Amino acid sequence: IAGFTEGGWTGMVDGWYGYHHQNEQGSGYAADQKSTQNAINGITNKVNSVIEKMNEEIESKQIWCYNAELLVLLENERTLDFHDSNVKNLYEKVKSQLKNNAKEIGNGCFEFYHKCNDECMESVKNGTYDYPKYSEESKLNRE
Amino acid sequence: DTICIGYHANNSTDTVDTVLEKNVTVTHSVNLLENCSAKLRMVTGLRNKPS
């Protein structure tokens, strides 16, 4: 089962962004440690920044109350789009690795034209995937 | 053999409003009422859409 187009993964607790793999060895959820941490470094930075801006009278304090609530809305906007941007980078981070050794199923999943064991799976996840290693295997199976 | 790319979801009921949308459900949010508007929820987590 998919996959980020159709919805979120309740099975994955250890990350904001991740992979799910199924093969002869097993099926499981894994977190992408790099991209999530970057995001946290990012999310936290804005949050610290937002707080810093914060510190006739009833009347003016109502003005100020306004100032925050607007800021929240901007940053909440900026935030969710930041994630949406990031999930895209990851899919594509992967799509750029696999090329035609795999099929893009659509809805955010990939199905391999070659056999993928846990070691190859990991190579995909860490950005060291060896396209030529399986590329001959993949070319044939497509046909 | 398959691999999937996905995002996090959970049973968080927290909701926030953004410019374009109102009451979006998210995985985690922080409430800034420590230091009024009654709701000053700021999203940290991502949008909650379970499978």
Partner: antibody, heavy 121, light 110 residues
């Protein structure tokens, strides 16, 4: 440079509860996972649980579950450990530690001085 | 203890000595390994993480390895200051918790 600052040593009669504090001094740790680890006197390390405030996680050891309340505060850069239903067996030295990243898989590279807590009737 | 460590090890100065960690598949088998160094009455220090990675400040004579459900920490050219208690650690998939070895006492008898 980041530093972890814990409340001073505590002593309690059994069955009461004690809450121990951890301040991130000289920077924030909100973007990190933090764990509470206890050392009984002359004993090995024992994981109690952890919290990652921005990530949105609160985690518990199975054994300390239902008895411990771990909470955090992003504004003050402070993490809390609360242990309940104290007994003599809960007498130990309690540490806070900051991980390499947001989650508990990474090695813990910054440690608080530790706070000693002793339970005697 | 989910992780198995020898109670004590000994070495003379200049020797290479090794410390063992025995686990099951639920922890070391599926998780990265961390090593900690502790001087008496003081807080622990992180020595090795992710099985073989070493912090920049730690002398090169420290090294780590992991095989199967067991791990080994190697200190070559042992020195008097290395005398301390050593803990292996890993995440445990069955327990959903960090687990620790019983602790290992290294003695540098010079």
């Amino acid at each position: 440079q980041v530093q972890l600052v814990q409340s001073g040593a505590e002593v309690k009669k059994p069955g009461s509860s004690v809450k121990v504090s951890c301040k991130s001094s000289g920077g924030t740790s909100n973007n990190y996972a933090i764990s509470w680890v206890r050392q009984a006197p002359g004993q090995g390390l024992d994981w109690m649980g952890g919290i990652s405030p921005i990530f949105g996680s609160t985690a518990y050891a199975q054994k300390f579950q239902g008895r411990v309340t771990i909470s955090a505060d992003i504004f003050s850069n402070t993490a809390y450990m609360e242990l309940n239903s104290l007994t003599s067996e809960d007498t130990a030295v309690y540490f806070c530690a900051r991980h390499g990243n947001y989650y508990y898989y990474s090695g813990m590279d910054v440690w608080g001085q530790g706070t000693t807590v002793t339970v005697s009737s | 203890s989910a992780l198995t460590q020898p109670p004590a090890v000994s070495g003379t100065p200049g020797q290479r000595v090794t410390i063992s960690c025995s686990g099951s598949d639920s922890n070391i088998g599926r998780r990265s390994v961390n090593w900690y160094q502790q001087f008496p009455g003081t807080a622990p220090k992180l020595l090795i993480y992710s099985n073989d990675q070493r912090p920049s400040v730690v002398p090169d004579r420290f090294s780590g390895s992991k095989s199967g459900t067991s791990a080994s920490l190697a200190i070559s050219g042992l020195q008097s200051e290395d005398e301390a208690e050593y803990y292996c650690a890993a995440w445990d998939d069955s327990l959903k918790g960090a687990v620790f070895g019983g602790g290992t006492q290294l003695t540098v008898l010079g």
